[PDB]
PDB file of C-alpha atoms and ligand atoms in Angstrom:
ATOM      1  CA  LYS A 503       0.107  -0.022   0.063  1.00  0.00           C
ATOM      2  CA  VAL A 504       2.155   3.081  -1.445  1.00  0.00           C
ATOM      3  CA  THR A 505       2.472   5.947   0.979  1.00  0.00           C
ATOM      4  CA  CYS A 506       4.852   9.331   0.101  1.00  0.00           C
ATOM      5  CA  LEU A 507       7.554   9.354   1.756  1.00  0.00           C
ATOM      6  CA  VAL A 508       7.527  13.326   2.421  1.00  0.00           C
ATOM      7  CA  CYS A 509       4.134  13.787   4.173  1.00  0.00           C
ATOM      8  CA  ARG A 510       3.446  10.151   5.423  1.00  0.00           C
ATOM      9  CA  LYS A 511      -0.390   9.742   3.063  1.00  0.00           C
ATOM     10  CA  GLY A 512      -1.524   7.662   0.721  1.00  0.00           C
ATOM     11  CA  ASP A 513      -3.807   9.839  -1.114  1.00  0.00           C
ATOM     12  CA  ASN A 514      -4.270  10.822  -4.156  1.00  0.00           C
ATOM     13  CA  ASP A 515      -2.794   7.752  -5.416  1.00  0.00           C
ATOM     14  CA  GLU A 516      -2.512   8.753  -9.118  1.00  0.00           C
ATOM     15  CA  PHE A 517      -0.133  11.389  -8.136  1.00  0.00           C
ATOM     16  CA  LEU A 518       2.363   8.314  -6.059  1.00  0.00           C
ATOM     17  CA  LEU A 519       5.449   7.773  -7.427  1.00  0.00           C
ATOM     18  CA  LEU A 520       6.516   4.337  -6.640  1.00  0.00           C
ATOM     19  CA  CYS A 521      10.272   3.986  -6.717  1.00  0.00           C
ATOM     20  CA  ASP A 522      11.723   1.415  -8.626  1.00  0.00           C
ATOM     21  CA  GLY A 523      13.996  -0.331  -6.454  1.00  0.00           C
ATOM     22  CA  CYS A 524      11.740  -0.443  -3.013  1.00  0.00           C
ATOM     23  CA  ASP A 525       8.222  -0.783  -1.831  1.00  0.00           C
ATOM     24  CA  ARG A 526       8.716   3.371  -1.008  1.00  0.00           C
ATOM     25  CA  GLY A 527       6.475   5.955  -2.950  1.00  0.00           C
ATOM     26  CA  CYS A 528       6.694  10.217  -2.696  1.00  0.00           C
ATOM     27  CA  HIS A 529       3.632  12.421  -4.170  1.00  0.00           C
ATOM     28  CA  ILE A 530       4.984  14.312  -7.738  1.00  0.00           C
ATOM     29  CA  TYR A 531       3.147  17.689  -5.500  1.00  0.00           C
ATOM     30  CA  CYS A 532       5.807  16.721  -1.960  1.00  0.00           C
ATOM     31  CA  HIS A 533       8.788  15.930  -4.260  1.00  0.00           C
ATOM     32  CA  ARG A 534      11.716  18.592  -3.769  1.00  0.00           C
ATOM     33  CA  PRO A 535      12.587  19.555  -6.727  1.00  0.00           C
ATOM     34  CA  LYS A 536       9.278  20.117  -8.037  1.00  0.00           C
ATOM     35  CA  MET A 537       7.536  17.437 -10.263  1.00  0.00           C
ATOM     36  CA  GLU A 538       5.061  18.421 -12.913  1.00  0.00           C
ATOM     37  CA  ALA A 539       3.850  15.261 -13.944  1.00  0.00           C
ATOM     38  CA  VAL A 540       5.046  11.616 -12.701  1.00  0.00           C
ATOM     39  CA  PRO A 541       7.484  10.756 -14.884  1.00  0.00           C
ATOM     40  CA  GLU A 542       8.153   7.284 -17.137  1.00  0.00           C
ATOM     41  CA  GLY A 543      11.198   5.007 -17.403  1.00  0.00           C
ATOM     42  CA  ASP A 544      12.486   4.758 -13.382  1.00  0.00           C
ATOM     43  CA  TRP A 545      12.518   6.736 -10.714  1.00  0.00           C
ATOM     44  CA  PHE A 546      14.577   5.660  -7.339  1.00  0.00           C
ATOM     45  CA  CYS A 547      13.494   6.975  -3.917  1.00  0.00           C
ATOM     46  CA  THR A 548      16.884   8.510  -2.013  1.00  0.00           C
ATOM     47  CA  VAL A 549      17.319   5.475  -0.022  1.00  0.00           C
ATOM     48  CA  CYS A 550      17.645   3.126  -3.309  1.00  0.00           C
ATOM     49  CA  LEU A 551      20.232   6.389  -4.635  1.00  0.00           C
ATOM     50  CA  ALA A 552      22.188   6.251  -1.333  1.00  0.00           C
ATOM     51  CA  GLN A 553      22.719   2.732  -2.539  1.00  0.00           C
ATOM     52  CA  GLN A 554      24.549   3.140  -5.862  1.00  0.00           C
TER      53      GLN A 554
ATOM     54  CA  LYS B 773      27.519  28.463 -11.554  1.00  0.00           C
ATOM     55  CA  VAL B 774      25.459  25.896 -10.358  1.00  0.00           C
ATOM     56  CA  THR B 775      22.633  27.194  -8.415  1.00  0.00           C
ATOM     57  CA  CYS B 776      20.050  24.817  -6.722  1.00  0.00           C
ATOM     58  CA  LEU B 777      16.923  24.378  -8.249  1.00  0.00           C
ATOM     59  CA  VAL B 778      14.686  25.008  -5.046  1.00  0.00           C
ATOM     60  CA  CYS B 779      16.840  27.217  -2.742  1.00  0.00           C
ATOM     61  CA  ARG B 780      18.135  29.015  -6.715  1.00  0.00           C
ATOM     62  CA  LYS B 781      21.438  29.951  -4.701  1.00  0.00           C
ATOM     63  CA  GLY B 782      24.491  28.063  -5.689  1.00  0.00           C
ATOM     64  CA  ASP B 783      26.461  28.655  -2.094  1.00  0.00           C
ATOM     65  CA  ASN B 784      27.521  25.523   0.050  1.00  0.00           C
ATOM     66  CA  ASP B 785      28.816  23.727  -2.944  1.00  0.00           C
ATOM     67  CA  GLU B 786      30.077  20.476  -0.950  1.00  0.00           C
ATOM     68  CA  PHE B 787      26.490  19.983  -0.799  1.00  0.00           C
ATOM     69  CA  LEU B 788      25.346  20.457  -4.363  1.00  0.00           C
ATOM     70  CA  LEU B 789      24.376  17.324  -6.347  1.00  0.00           C
ATOM     71  CA  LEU B 790      25.126  17.958  -9.871  1.00  0.00           C
ATOM     72  CA  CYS B 791      22.322  16.105 -12.842  1.00  0.00           C
ATOM     73  CA  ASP B 792      23.986  13.833 -14.641  1.00  0.00           C
ATOM     74  CA  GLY B 793      21.495  14.907 -17.719  1.00  0.00           C
ATOM     75  CA  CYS B 794      22.204  18.779 -17.459  1.00  0.00           C
ATOM     76  CA  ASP B 795      23.865  21.731 -16.373  1.00  0.00           C
ATOM     77  CA  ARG B 796      21.175  21.640 -13.393  1.00  0.00           C
ATOM     78  CA  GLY B 797      21.773  21.282  -9.316  1.00  0.00           C
ATOM     79  CA  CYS B 798      20.286  20.521  -5.929  1.00  0.00           C
ATOM     80  CA  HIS B 799      21.437  21.086  -2.487  1.00  0.00           C
ATOM     81  CA  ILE B 800      20.851  17.832  -0.849  1.00  0.00           C
ATOM     82  CA  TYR B 801      19.349  19.716   2.200  1.00  0.00           C
ATOM     83  CA  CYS B 802      16.954  20.980  -0.139  1.00  0.00           C
ATOM     84  CA  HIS B 803      15.957  17.831  -1.689  1.00  0.00           C
ATOM     85  CA  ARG B 804      12.841  15.887  -0.677  1.00  0.00           C
ATOM     86  CA  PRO B 805      12.195  13.005   0.276  1.00  0.00           C
ATOM     87  CA  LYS B 806      15.228  12.982   1.964  1.00  0.00           C
ATOM     88  CA  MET B 807      18.702  12.911   1.011  1.00  0.00           C
ATOM     89  CA  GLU B 808      21.404  12.799   4.018  1.00  0.00           C
ATOM     90  CA  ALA B 809      24.463  12.630   1.105  1.00  0.00           C
ATOM     91  CA  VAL B 810      26.045  13.141  -2.446  1.00  0.00           C
ATOM     92  CA  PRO B 811      25.221   9.965  -3.909  1.00  0.00           C
ATOM     93  CA  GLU B 812      27.403   8.109  -5.924  1.00  0.00           C
ATOM     94  CA  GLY B 813      26.870   6.742  -9.869  1.00  0.00           C
ATOM     95  CA  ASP B 814      23.785   8.955 -11.228  1.00  0.00           C
ATOM     96  CA  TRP B 815      21.097  11.531 -10.237  1.00  0.00           C
ATOM     97  CA  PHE B 816      18.730  12.964 -12.651  1.00  0.00           C
ATOM     98  CA  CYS B 817      16.937  16.589 -12.062  1.00  0.00           C
ATOM     99  CA  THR B 818      13.115  16.797 -12.515  1.00  0.00           C
ATOM    100  CA  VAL B 819      13.276  18.272 -15.601  1.00  0.00           C
ATOM    101  CA  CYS B 820      15.690  15.349 -16.943  1.00  0.00           C
ATOM    102  CA  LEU B 821      13.292  12.882 -15.275  1.00  0.00           C
ATOM    103  CA  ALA B 822      10.231  14.149 -17.508  1.00  0.00           C
ATOM    104  CA  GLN B 823      12.614  13.362 -20.512  1.00  0.00           C
ATOM    105  CA  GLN B 824      12.692   9.572 -20.133  1.00  0.00           C
ATOM    106  CA  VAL B 825      10.476   7.305 -21.266  1.00  0.00           C
TER     107      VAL B 825
HETATM  108 ZN1   ZN C 956       3.008  13.222  -0.209  1.00  0.00          ZN
HETATM  109 ZN1   ZN C 957      13.651   3.018  -3.231  1.00  0.00          ZN
HETATM  110 ZN1   ZN C 958      19.340  24.630  -2.234  1.00  0.00          ZN
HETATM  111 ZN1   ZN C 959      18.463  17.296 -15.271  1.00  0.00          ZN
END
């Protein structure tokens, strides 16, 4: 059940990015820098980025 | 002079993530979700994420 790392909510799930490497998520509107849309391809959360 | 996308400042450059797709940047402390350190390998800014398929 995906939830936003920033605000901790799982609401508005059409706007939740799901990490490609783990179960974590983020609303595009909670992300900084700002994101205007859900991107295609792969998005990695900061925990996954910290492992690469 | 790289500037942060969030706060628009170019200070504390040791804390500035640099995009591998363009010349944009972001302080780790301005990033959300939390970024405690500059990662190794690659980081893409939101403008570049929007070009992916
Ligand atoms: Zn959120
Ligand atoms: Zn992840
Ligand atoms: Zn900044
Ligand atoms: Zn970029």
